[PDB]
Amino acid sequence: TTIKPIEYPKDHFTMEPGANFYTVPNLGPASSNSDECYTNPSFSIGSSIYMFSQEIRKTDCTAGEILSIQIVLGRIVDKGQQGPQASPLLVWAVPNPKIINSCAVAAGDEMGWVLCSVTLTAASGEPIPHMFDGFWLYKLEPDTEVVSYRITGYAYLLDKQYDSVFIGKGGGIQKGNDLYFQMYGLSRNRQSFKALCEHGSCLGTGGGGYQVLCDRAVMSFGSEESLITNAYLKVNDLASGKPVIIGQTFPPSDSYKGSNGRMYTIGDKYGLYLAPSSWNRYLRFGITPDISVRSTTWLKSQDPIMKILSTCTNTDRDMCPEICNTRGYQDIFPLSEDSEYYTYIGITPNNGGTKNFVAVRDSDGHIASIDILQNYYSITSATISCFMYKDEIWCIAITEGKKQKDNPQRIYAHSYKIRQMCY
Ligand SMILES: [Cl-]
Ligand SMILES: [Cl-]
Ligand SMILES: [Cl-]
């Protein structure tokens, strides 16, 4: 009862973030072990419960061994503070984390879901890295033992053969008897393609040089037969206890290099965020009425532009294609049915640290931003979910970062409201 799904609001009507950025302590637990990095959270809010997952890795945040994947089912509640607060209900770990490629969460009605892709295992039980051996799906519910669903070849179909599969850490959604997630990985290709290659004014050579770079940017180490692609995953047949997963791939002509994504419910339609993994660092966000590649329309707005965690050297203005890697994540949350209004967090490099802001983008392109997290040395990611709380739109933002320069990376939660105004 304390929160509800967002109700989009009904002279210039503008929206802006609230003045303050309140802490949401202990949304999930954390050890002080300086040799552990907490990274790649997934955060989903349903009707009242939330779902949260985090990878705990040894030493290295990017390639370090996954020591644990920790899951929290909780509730967003009022504890008499200035903003909404979190109450964990279940703290649980994914079995056999060394076999996991990645997992993400989806919050439902008094229950939550964890979808994980796994790699193959040797006879020793050790993982064979870079591979794919189907999925595990877990259903978490208070006062109910976790239900596990092993989903191997007989129970999934992908429109292309994937040698590796990673669930998009942004998370998934439940709609009725189905779950929807996003995944990315290595898919096999045998046909020619013309990769998406939208950019600004870029000085060319022969004229097709940038298109060649765009094609090569979606290939795996220069191989035309292994591409890094995105796919929608639909999880069918939940009530039967034998779920079936159907996957549908975005062609390179409709996507940049595959990356971590997120599914959204947007009124009676749906949304998709795709983090930049490559040379195109603008916002990549699609709206679809039925969750299909054919019906996914991309927002024209550019913000946020990913400016950290990239080997690219192109400009924010022209974004010229090149072979480079981007590893950040900064999603948005729609504040209107067409997502022409939305909130997000921006992050800019400041030598080893970052400067950060929370923002609302209005349908006319106006950006209302406020500097945030100035007491943090660096913030490197953001995922945002908003909802109704005490008769207003409130949001919770989950951010990886380092409080002080020498600290190990941790995951932090804050809240803020959305203000509605007329000028
Ligand atoms: Cl080609
Ligand atoms: Cl069913
Ligand atoms: Cl930005």
Numbering used by the authors: 175 to 184, 193 to 605
Tell me what the authors wrote about this structure, in their words.
A construct encoding some residues from the putative MojV-G stalk region (residues 166–193), the β-propeller domain (residues 194–605) and the C-terminal extension (residues 606–625), was expressed in HEK 293T cells in the presence of an α-mannosidase inhibitor, kifunensine. Following deglycosylation with endoglycosidase F1 (EndoF1), MojV-G was crystallized and the structure was determined to 1.94 Å resolution. MojV-G exhibits a six-bladed β-propeller fold, characteristic of Paramyxovirinae attachment glycoproteins, with each blade of the propeller composed of four antiparallel β-strands. The β-propeller fold is stabilized by seven disulfide bonds, all of which are conserved among HNVs. Two nearly identical molecules of MojV-G were observed in the asymmetric unit (0.33 Å root-mean-square (RMS) deviation over 412 aligned Cα atoms), although crystallographic contacts were not consistent with the formation of higher-order MojV-G oligomers, such as those observed in HeV-G18 or other paramyxoviruses. However, a portion of the crystallized N-terminal stalk region was clearly visible (residues 175–193) and folds underneath the sixth blade of the β-propeller domain in a conformation analogous to that observed in full-length Newcastle disease virus (NDV) HN glycoprotein and parainfluenza 5 HN (PIV5-HN) glycoprotein ectodomain structures. Unlike other paramyxovirus attachment glycoproteins, which are glycosylated throughout the β-propeller18192021222324353637383940414243444546, the ectodomain of MojV-G encodes only four N-linked glycosylation sequons, all of which are located outside the β-propeller domain. Indeed, we observe that paramyxoviral receptor-interacting surfaces exhibit some of the greatest levels of structural deviation with respect to MojV-G. For example, the top face of the MojV-G β-propeller lacks the distinctive ephrin binding pocket observed in NiV-G and other HNVs, and exhibits very low sequence conservation with other HNVs at this region.
Investigation of bat, rat and musk shrew samples from within the cave, where the victims had most probably contracted the disease, led to the discovery of a novel rat-borne paramyxovirus, Mòjiāng virus (MojV)1. Analysis of the MojV genome reveals that the paramyxovirus is closely related to viruses within the genus Henipavirus, an emergent zoonotic group of bat-borne pathogens distributed throughout Asia, Australia, Central America and Africa. Viral attachment is a primary determinant of host cell tropism and is initiated by a haemagglutinin-neuraminidase (HN) glycoprotein, haemagglutinin (H) glycoprotein or attachment (G) glycoprotein, depending on the virus. Although MojV-G displays a six-bladed β-propeller fold characteristic to paramyxoviral attachment glycoproteins, our analyses also show that MojV-G is antigenically, structurally and functionally distinct from all other characterized paramyxoviruses.
